[PDB]
A paper describes a structure:
The cow antibody repertoire contains a unique subset (~10%) of antibodies possessing ultralong CDRH3s, which can reach lengths between 50 to 70 amino acids. The unique CDRH3 structure can be separated into two microdomains where the antigen-binding disulfide-bound “knob” sits on top of a long b-ribbon “stalk” and can bind to both surface and receded epitopes. Ultimately, we isolated a total of 8 and 11 cross-clade nAbs from cow-485 and cow-488, respectively, all of which had ultralong CDRH3s, suggesting only ultralong antibodies were responsible for cross-clade neutralization detected in sera. BnAbs from cow-485 were named Bess, while bnAbs from cow-488 were named ElsE and assigned numbers based on their order of discovery.
The ElsE Fabs all have CDRH3s with 54 amino acids and 4 cysteines, with a 1–3, 2–4 connectivity, Bess7 has a 61-amino acid CDRH3 with 8 cysteines (1–6, 2–5, 3–7, 4–8 connectivity), while the 55-amino acid CDRH3 knob region for Bess 4 (6 Cys, 1–3, 2–5, 4–6 connectivity) has no ordered electron density in the crystal structure. Bess4 is the bnAb with the broadest neuralization activity among the lineage and was able to neutralize seven of the 12 viruses from the global panel (58% breadth), and the broadest ElsE antibody neutralized 67% of the panel. Of further note, the CDRH3 sequences of Bess4 and Bess5 are very similar, but the more potent Bess4 does not have detectable tyrosine sulfation while Bess5 does, which could be due to a YD motif present in Bess5 but not Bess4. To assess epitope specificities of the recombinant mAbs, Bess4 and ElseE2 were selected as Bess and ElsE representatives for competition biolayer interferometry (BLI) against a panel of human antibodies that target known bnAb epitopes on the Env trimer of virus 25710. The BLI experiments demonstrated competition of Bess and ElsE representatives with antibodies CAP256-VRC26.09 and PGT145. To better understand and define the epitope recognized, we chose Bess4 and ElsE2 as representatives to look at the effect of V2-apex epitope mutations on BG505 virus neutralization. Bess4 and ElsE2 neutralization titers were knocked out or reduced 30- to almost 400-fold for Bess4 and ElsE2, respectively, when mutations at position N156, N160, and K169 were introduced. Human bnAbs PGT145, PG9, and CAP256-VRC26.09 are similarly affected by mutations at these residues on the V2-apex epitope, suggesting Bess and ElsE bind to the V2- apex of the trimer spike.
Numbering used by the authors:
A (entry chain L): 2 to 9, 11 to 27, 27A, 27B, 28 to 95, 95A, 95B, 96 to 106, ...
B (entry chain H): 2 to 82, 82A, 82B, 82C, 83 to 103, 148 to 269
Write the structure that this text describes.
């Protein structure tokens, strides 16, 4: 089976949010639910066990509670570090077949807005001497994480050969994204300039690189 | 308590995935070792566990393809997944589970205590390919009047993952490593960037260390500024 969890919940910095963990009378009914935190790029971290007990190192702002066939994980005084995926888990009676929840992505709102800074790297000497050419557009230090990226060649739109990652959190809890434009050295040498156009909250930052001189 | 997963990161479809887990610093509460995996975009999935007495419990939806044995002498646990499909590509975790008695009747309570680092496994017929590493050199464009951005480009590798550090991990402040893009050719690429003070560009050498375990490849690319 799978325990029912809300797909995603949101809370403001310094507030409290609760994540519900619904189940049947066999898994959560017996009632010893556990809670785990998955930060991308890190091993899962046990938060709560035995419904209420906090695991080793878990601050007191993480609490647990159960009511019949529904357990609840409450996080008070939300910090930006609390943005992660949360899963509940319970033993299905026989204590040999664990069941995890569908998962809940917690996003922390109320962070200061930040405009993106964009760096556009031309292909290097090494890559150009390998019959390859890739333009790398790195976007960092922006919030919220909703941007669009567009490439130009001599102010004419380019749609082919573009690969872009989804925004991801960085060290200072701001977002960063990357986009790439794969070319042949002939194409790179052909045009007079190339541009990476990043749009964030109605405004647009554009970086231009040229093959002529760097 | 330390748990280390070992095994292949690439397996061909229809083959058998074999994973080992070596534990160090076992305590008295570590009474069973279990296996959990997480496919991309899906929730955590329990696989099975085995206790000190040798009893094995399996996920009933997968027991026809799972086997879990242990070697307490070497302090190891092994997981085998037979006839793998692309639905079996996931990060496989080794775990120590605890069992504390609430007794008051025998009401028990189980939870995962320590999680392993996780081993990323990809099911595919494509061949392993080590990465080409090129430098993203800082120029008079990539400077921000005091800070300058530099990085390295890890191009065309398979399969995931690729880890990148800077100066053999001596440089961590201001580093960001982006997730990978899956090109049309079926190869992965990512970038690692770090912002440094502009003054140090002529006094501090910056070397990006790319590591690609799936092909046992390690690259140390030096990133020199553009003249």
């Amino acid at each position: 089976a799978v325990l029912n969890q809300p797909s995603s919940v949101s809370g403001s910095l310094g507030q409290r949010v609760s994540i519900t963990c619904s189940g049947s009378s066999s898994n959560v009914g017996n009632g010893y639910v556990s809670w785990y935190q998955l930060i991308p790029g890190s091993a899962p971290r046990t938060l709560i066990y035995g419904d209420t007990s906090r695991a080793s190192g878990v601050p007191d702002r993480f609490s647990g509670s159960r009511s019949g066939n529904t357990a609840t994980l409450t996080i008070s005084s939300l910090q930006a570090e609390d943005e992660a995926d949360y899963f509940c888990a319970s033993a299905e009676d026989s204590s040999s077949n664990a069941v995890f929840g569908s998962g809940t992505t917690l996003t922390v709102l109320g962070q200061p807005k930040a405009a993106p800074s964009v760096t556009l790297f031309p292909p290097s000497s090494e890559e150009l001497q390998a019959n390859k050419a890739t333009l790398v557009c790195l976007i960092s230090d922006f919030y919220p994480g909703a941007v669009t990226v567009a490439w130009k060649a001599d102010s004419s739109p380019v749609k082919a050969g573009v690969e872009t990652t989804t925004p991801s959190k960085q060290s200072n809890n701001k977002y960063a994204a990357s986009s790439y434009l794969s070319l042949t050295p002939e194409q790179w040498k052909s045009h007079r300039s190339y541009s990476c156009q990043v749009t964030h909250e109605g405004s647009t930052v554009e970086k231009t690189v040229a093959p002529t001189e760097c | 308590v330390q748990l280390r997963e070992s095994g292949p990161s690439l397996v061909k479809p229809s083959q058998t995935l074999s994973l080992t887990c070596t534990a160090s610093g076992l305590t008295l509460s570590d009474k069973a070792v279990g296996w959990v995996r997480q496919a991309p975009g899906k929730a955590l999935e329990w696989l099975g566990s085995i206790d000190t007495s040798g009893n094995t419990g399996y996920n009933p939806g997968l027991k026809s393809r799972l086997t879990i044995t242990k070697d307490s002498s070497k302090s190891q646990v092994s997981l085998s997944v037979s006839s793998v499909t692309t639905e079996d590509s996931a990060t496989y975790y080794c775990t120590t589970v605890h069992q504390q008695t609430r007794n008051k009747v025998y009401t028990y309570e189980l939870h995962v205590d320590t999680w392993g680092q996780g081993l990323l496994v990809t099911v595919s017929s494509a061949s392993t390919k080590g990465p080409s590493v090129f430098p993203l050199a800082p120029s008079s464009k990539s400077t921000s009047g005091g800070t300058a951005a530099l990085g390295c480009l890890v191009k065309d590798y398979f399969p995931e993952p690729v880890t990148v550090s800077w100066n053999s991990c001596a440089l961590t402040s201001g580093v960001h490593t982006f997730p990978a893009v899956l090109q049309s050719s079926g190869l992965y690429s990512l970038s690692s960037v770090v912002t440094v003070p502009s003054s140090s560009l002529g006094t501090q050498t910056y070397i990006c260390n790319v590591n690609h375990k799936p092909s046992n490849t390690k690259v140390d690319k030096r990133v020199e500024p553009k003249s």
